[PDB]
Structure 1
Amino acid sequence: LEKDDKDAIEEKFRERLKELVVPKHVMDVVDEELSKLGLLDNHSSEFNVTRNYLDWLTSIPWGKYSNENLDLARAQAVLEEDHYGMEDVKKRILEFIAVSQLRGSTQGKILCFYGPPGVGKTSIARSIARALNREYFRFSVGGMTDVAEIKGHRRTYVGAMPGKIIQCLKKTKTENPLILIDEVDKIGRGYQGDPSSALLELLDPEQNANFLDHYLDVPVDLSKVLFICTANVTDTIPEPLRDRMEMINVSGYVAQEKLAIAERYLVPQARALCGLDESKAKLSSDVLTLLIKQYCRESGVRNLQKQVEKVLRKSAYKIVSGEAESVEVTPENLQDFVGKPVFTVERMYDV
């Protein structure tokens, strides 16, 4: 077993590294460690750390890129297909694809939506990632207070693994994932190395190219990512970190727009969810108008979500074991069919 066994894996790391355009910072560090692996007995207690370190270091993609759809004409459709309104964020992504159409190679940026809850902030990134066609990911940071998740540990410790971003980058083979940090403003104070101190080193647009996770210390390029971050309010963020990234402000909706979203997605979205059908559980557009005028006039689009869902489920139970084979919601019933209205119709002096 002089040439057997060890030669297999040592060749294996070659093969997996062949196709990549390995950066020169790494290519020195790799092969000498492969030599060190070639020296020692397979059962040597260190061998299982080195065999691990290569398995990560051979595996994280190095300059491999998932070519993105570039034409914006077709981008308009898919960007619109799954959300309505929100024109300014649509325009910002259109600008980004425009620039990337201009200067050849793909390139990243950072952004930070923020605004009223339920505007659609978290609900868009999946759409964008389908739009550009760069690989999606998501990574909530809410309440996190341990920097190790953004960094990893030193590999001296048993079982140490690289910071979460590297696990992402392995799991989404392309080098330019659409990372989506989330709920940034509610990130915790860990009272010993809180994460806000960490994030600045990642998110700085110029310094980002040399992020260095503690586990495998070799620098990784990261300009290509398109980070996105969201928060319902933008005061908790420390001042420099607030400086680092653009703050698009998602807008709250208005009752014309609420009705607009209503017919297009919401009612179908839940009618399929409950299994009802057209002509068995019909809703007038005037019922949808009245729900907004009376029962829900808040900036979000969750509240109306719950009204228009409950209105269906009442009909659900009212059919399957009730006496009517088909409900037909009409305005005359709503005051009882959903509860008493919140908003009053301010009609005091008609005389």
Structure 2
Amino acid sequence: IEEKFRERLKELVVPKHVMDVVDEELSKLGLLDNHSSEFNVTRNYLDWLTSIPWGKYSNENLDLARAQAVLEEDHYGMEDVKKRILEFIAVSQLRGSTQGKILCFYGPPGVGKTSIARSIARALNREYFRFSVGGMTDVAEIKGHRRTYVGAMPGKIIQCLKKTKTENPLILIDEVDKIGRGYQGDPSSALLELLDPEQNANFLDHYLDVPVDLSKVLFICTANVTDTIPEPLRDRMEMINVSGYVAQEKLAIAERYLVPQARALCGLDESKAKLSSDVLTLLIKQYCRESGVRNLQKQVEKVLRKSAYKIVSGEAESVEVTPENLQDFVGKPVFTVERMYDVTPPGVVMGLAWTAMGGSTLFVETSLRRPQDKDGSLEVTGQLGEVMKESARIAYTFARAFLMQHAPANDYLVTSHIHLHVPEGATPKDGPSAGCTIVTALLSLAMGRPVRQNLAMTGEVSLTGKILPVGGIKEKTIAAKRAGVTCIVLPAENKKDFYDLAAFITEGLEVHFVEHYREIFDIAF
């Protein structure tokens, strides 16, 4: 009994403030009797004390090339996270010994937040451990119970230290925003004691009742929304945003991971069900336009299970999935046409919008409301917000001014009653952008000239005609590319945002960066 417990303290380096504790407890076994309850209480207390890895670590891989390779093997291009892990390795290698950070990944569902912790622990050569926190009500899971109680036990972190056999593991603390806040023992405060670098050097577990040094662990927290993470907890984490993916990233992810795994599951090989890349492109374009990859995975599983039924029911013996019969496998498309006008009449002009499901492409229709060429009016419909109505008024005034200075004998836009409509009347829309779009719609209506055909434009306009920056350039460019736009027009102060996009996004786009509206006029006509 004593021999094994004192031998277990050989390959470790036991600190004194706990070595005296284990010695005091050993001095009790000789007195107590093997029949008593105190005997077994102290026996398994000593088991827990000697089982803790008191000074040992893992052979942490501080090689950068190997870490980069093992990181890029498991997931496709989560660069904002891999960069951070590599800088963490570099810093941990410059300042000597191993380190410990407290990172937090947040983002939409299905982007790879939880899935990447295991590959990160493989890159660092650490012992990965995970426990979910969402819905947790009591602190005993984090802290534990005083060993006086009958069936007392240490808690999740001490059990992690015992099971990993090291004290620099990678503890993935999952769902730290869905954490319960029952105040009769609040687990958020225990999590604060865990994730607070000033005090996590002495994490006092209620069972061990000796402090453990949790300063060399790499905590990683996963959240879907940061605004319900407790504020003190949020003030001790490095929020790293794991954003979604785009069509080409989704295609790479599909081809490399999703289709092979779904084939391992459904039991079909590429000789039985051919999912070519054109089919996958069409699928991602018309069905899976979200940020994560769970829906696309479910669609792939759907096609594969329908082919499996076609084979097992003795009907096909082989299933060719072509972009013509994809409806038969996945149903009606969620997004279909990508543009309402093929050739724009004299009045309408294409704009670009922003949405959570990729970009969009909306048009701005204008029409003479009353029979004529006392001053003209502008009626504006299409579920427009206040900022958008105001921007329409600004665009109207500037269009009047510009047509007065450009063709002084037009008299349009001054004596005409015009109706402006942004179609899809059911959906609400707002934003200071589309000011240049509205100016162009009004001018093309007044001059009777349709604008360039494959032209799209975004940008705020001022009363004197200056073009001001806008947001969502990535989604707007993705939308214009998807709808077949060849020439895109952006404000000159979004040049950095446009040249910060991935190369495949802006491959064959003819971009024009403007400062005033006279340039937009020279381009659109």
User: Smaller-chain TM-score range?
Assistant: over 0.9
Separation in 1, partners of 2:328, 2:320:
14
User: CA offset at residue 42 of structure 1?
Assistant: 1.6
Q: Shift of residue 274 of structure 1?
A: 1.2
Measured after TM superposition, the shift of residue 90 of structure 1 is 0.5
Q: Which whole-Å CA distance do the structure 2 matches of 1:32 and 1:283 have between them?
A: 68
Equivalent in 198, 203, 210 of residue 211 of structure 1: 203
Q: Does residue 1:93 correspond to 2:76, yes or no?
A: no
Q: Please identify which structure carries the higher helix content.
A: 1
Task: Render the CA deviation track for 1:29-53: whole Å, top value 9, x for unaligned.
Answer: 1111111121122212211111111
The one-character-per-residue Cα deviations of 1:24-75 (angstroms, maximum 9, x if unpaired) are 1111111111111211222122111111111100111101111111111111
Deviations 1:251-281 (A, max 9, x none): 1111111111111111111112111111221
**Higher mean C-alpha deviation, range 301-310 or range 340-349:** 340-349
Q: Does 1:129 pair with 2:113?
A: no
Instruction: After superposing the two structures, state which structure 1 stretch, 236-245 or 99-108, moved more.
Output: 99-108
SS in 1 for 2:204: coil
CA contact (8 A) 2:145 2:152 kept: yes
Deviations 1:172-198 (A, max 9, x none): 101111111110100112131221121
Question: C-alpha displacement at 1:206, in angstroms?
Answer: 1.9
In the TM superposition, what is the alpha-carbon distance from 1:96 to its structure 2 partner? 1.0
Closer, same or farther: CA 100–346 of 1 in aligned 2, 3 Å: closer
Q: What is the CA distance between 1:199 and its match in structure 2?
A: 1.1
Are the structure 2 counterparts of residues 41 and 308 from structure 1 closer, same or farther at C-alpha, using a change threshold of 3 Å?
same
Instruction: Give the Cα separation in 2 of the matches to 1:346 and 1:55.
Output: 66
Instruction: Kindly state the Cα deviation for residue 147 of structure 1 after the two structures are TM-superposed.
Output: 0.5
- Tell whether the 8 Å contact from 2:52 to 2:162 is kept in structure 1 after alignment: yes
Q: 2:266 and 2:282 mapped to 1: Cα distance?
A: 22
CA distance in 2, matches of 1:280, 1:33: 67
Cα shift at 1:218: 0.8
> Following TM superposition, by how much is the alpha carbon of 1:201 offset from its aligned partner in structure 2, in angstroms?
1.1
Secondary structure in structure 1 of the residue aligned to 2:258: helix
Supply the distance in 2 between the matched residues of 1:19 and 1:331 (Cα, whole angstroms): 63
Q: C-alpha separation between the residues in 1 aligned to 2:280 and 2:141? A: 45
Pairs within 5 Å for 1:1-351: 9-349=1-341
Q: State the distance in 1 between where 2:132 and 2:292 align.
A: 21
Please state how far the C-alpha of 1:97 moved relative to its aligned partner: 1.0
Deviates more, 1:41-50 or 1:226-235: 41-50
C-alpha distance in structure 1 between counterparts of 2:43 and 2:203, whole Å = 24
Superposed displacement of residue 170, structure 1: 0.4
Q: Deviations over 1:201-244 (max 9, x none)?
A: 11111211011011111111110100111010011112111001
Displacement after TM superposition at 1:19 (Å): 1.7
**Secondary structure of 1:138's partner?**
strand
Moved more, 142-151 or 102-111: 102-111
* Shift in Å, 1:13: 0.9
With structure 2 as the length reference, what TM-score do the two structures score? 0.64
Q: How far did 1:312 drift?
A: 1.0
Unpaired runs of 5+ in structure 1?
Answer: 1-8
C-alpha displacement at 1:143, in angstroms? 0.1
Aligned equivalents of 2:75 and 2:340: distance in 1? 40
Distance 1:62 1:95 in 2: 28
Pairwise CA distance, 1:76: 1.2
* Partner SS, residue 60 of structure 2: coil
**CA deviation after TM superposition for structure 1 residue 348, in Å:** 3.0
Unaligned stretches of 5+ residues in structure 2: 342-525
Aligned equivalents of 1:265, 1:56: Cα separation in 2: 42
Q: CA deviation at 1:87?
A: 0.7
SS at match of 2:308: helix
Matched residue SS, 1:186: coil
Which protein is bigger by CA-based radius of gyration? 2
Residues in 1 aligned to 2:236 and 2:5: alpha-carbon distance in whole angstroms: 38
Q: Which has the higher contact order (CA 8 A, sep 6+)?
A: 1
Provide Cα deviations, 1:87-120, integer angstroms capped at 9, x if missing partner. 1100111011111222222111110001000001
State the TM-score, normalizing by the size of structure 1: 0.95
| Partner SS state of residue 238, structure 2 | coil
Deviating beyond 3 angstroms after TM superposition, the runs of 4 or more aligned structure 1 residues are none
Partners of 2:144 and 2:153 within 8 A in 1: yes
Q: Deviations over 1:121-167 (max 9, x none)?
A: 11011111111111111111110001001000111110101121101
Classify 1:341/1:108 alpha carbon distance in 2 versus 1 (closer, same or farther; 3 Å). same
- Measured after TM superposition, the shift of residue 336 of structure 1 is 2.3
CA contact (8 A) 2:105 2:240 kept: yes
State the aligned residue count.
Answer: 341
Q: Determine if contact 2:302/2:329 at 8 Å carries over to the other structure.
A: no
Query: Which has a greater percent of strand?
Result: 2
CA distance in 2, matches of 1:113, 1:192: 29
1 CA distance for matches of 2:304 and 2:37? 63
The answer to whether the 8 A contact 2:105-2:113 is kept is yes
| Cα distance in 2, alignment partners of residues 27 and 347 from structure 1 | 74
